[PDB]
A paper describes a structure:
Herein, we demonstrate the inhibitory activity of taniborbactam against PenI, the class A β-lactamase produced by B. pseudomallei. PenI was found to be an extended-spectrum β-lactamase (ESBL). Taniborbactam is a boronic acid β-lactamase inhibitor with a broad spectrum of activity that covers not only class A, C, and D serine β-lactamases but also many class B metallo-β-lactamases, including NDM (except NDM-9 and NDM-30) and VIM (except VIM-83). In conclusion, we demonstrated that PenI, the main mechanism of resistance to β-lactams in the pathogen B. pseudomallei, is effectively overcome by potent inhibition by taniborbactam.
The PenI–taniborbactam complex structure was solved in space group P21 at 1.25 Å resolution. The tail end of taniborbactam could not be resolved, as poor electron density was observed for the 2Fo-Fc map at 1.0 σ and the polder map (omit map) at 2.5 σ in this region; thus, the atom occupancies were set to 0.3. The high resolution of the active site allowed detection of the boron of taniborbactam bound to Ser70, as well as other direct hydrogen-bonding interactions of taniborbactam with residues Ser130, Asn132, Thr235, and Thr237 and water-bridged hydrogen-bonding interactions with Glu166 and Thr216. Therefore, the overall binding mode was like that observed in the KPC-2 structure in complex with taniborbactam, with some differences. For instance, the orientation of Tyr105 in PenI was different from that of Trp105 in the KPC-2/taniborbactam complex. In PenI, Tyr105 limited the freedom of taniborbactam to have alternate conformations. Also, in the PenI–taniborbactam complex, a disulfide bond between Cys77 and Cys123 as well as free thiols was observed with the ratio between the two at approximately 1:1. Of note, in the apo-PenI structure, only the free thiols were observed; thus, a disulfide bond appears to have formed upon complexing with taniborbactam. As the disulfide bond was not observed in the apo-PenI structure, we hypothesize that the binding of taniborbactam induces a conformational change that slightly shortens the distance between the Cys residues, allowing the formation of the disulfide bond. Thus, it is likely that the binding of taniborbactam by PenI led to the formation of the disulfide bond between Cys77 and Cys123, which would increase the stability of the PenI–taniborbactam complex and the residence time for the presence of taniborbactam in the complex.
Numbering used by the authors: 26 to 238, 240 to 252, 254 to 291
The structure:
Amino acid sequence: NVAAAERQLRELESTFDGRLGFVALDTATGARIAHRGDERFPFCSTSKMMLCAAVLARSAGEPALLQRRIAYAKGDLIRYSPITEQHVGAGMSVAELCAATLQYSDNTAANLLIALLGGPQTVTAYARSIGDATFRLDRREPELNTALPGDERDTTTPAAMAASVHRLLVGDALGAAQRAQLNAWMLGNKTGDARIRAGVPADWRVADKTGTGDYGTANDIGVAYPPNRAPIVFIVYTTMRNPNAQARDDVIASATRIAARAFA
Ligand SMILES: *[B@@]1([O])OC2=C(C([O])=O)[C]=[C][C]=C2[C][C]1[N]C(=O)[C][C]1[C][C][C]([N][C][C][N])[C][C]1
């Protein structure tokens, strides 16, 4: 019951002093549950999905690109870089940097990949090329996570991100090999156990990318793969009014459960 689910999302939002942006889409029927679907939210590290999709797209035209070694420096290292800091001095391949940024939310890896592509504007241009007129990447890590009230930098809408996740992981925005690699990376994410993954039935597989930012911002985007039915896209953006808010996992899990029940 889409209308019942949307009411429950409104009730969930009433429990905290912030905003919930949500879209769930059953890709077979197009059944769609949304809350604040056309409002902008700070996407934080969920942008790393669009970044790596852009890298994969480049690799379709440069066969050796994913195996190229990037010999980055200690001076490139910034906070929340659990893979790149361990391997500095040996370097990492482009594929390994994508895996790190997607599965561990590695910030240095994202900056290296942004630089490889030519800057944050190339990620925005990639989004436009797949039909997303809304996503905008304005800054690099870590400043893209400031999540300031009313700031449109480094934002998208839940609706635009739902369409982009659909086209990238389920549809044909990427070639088959690139779609499979993006899925494989996101299926292996390590940072989302308490978010979308905590709100779905035990037999659903999940490909997701989380984000956490200032103003208690807590996001998760991805696709659930139930057995014997089509994939379901889940987009969850949350951001709080208190600059001193502590980011939570439980609102995302609760919003996910609402939609999972509706799509039972
Ligand atoms: B990013 O948004 O992804 C990310 C997550 C995530 O995937 O949920 C968790 C932890 C770090 C990161 C890196 C990216 N975010 C930031 O760099 C901003 C940073 C995240 C940690 C917060 N810590 C507050 C005090 N416990 C503050 C902002």
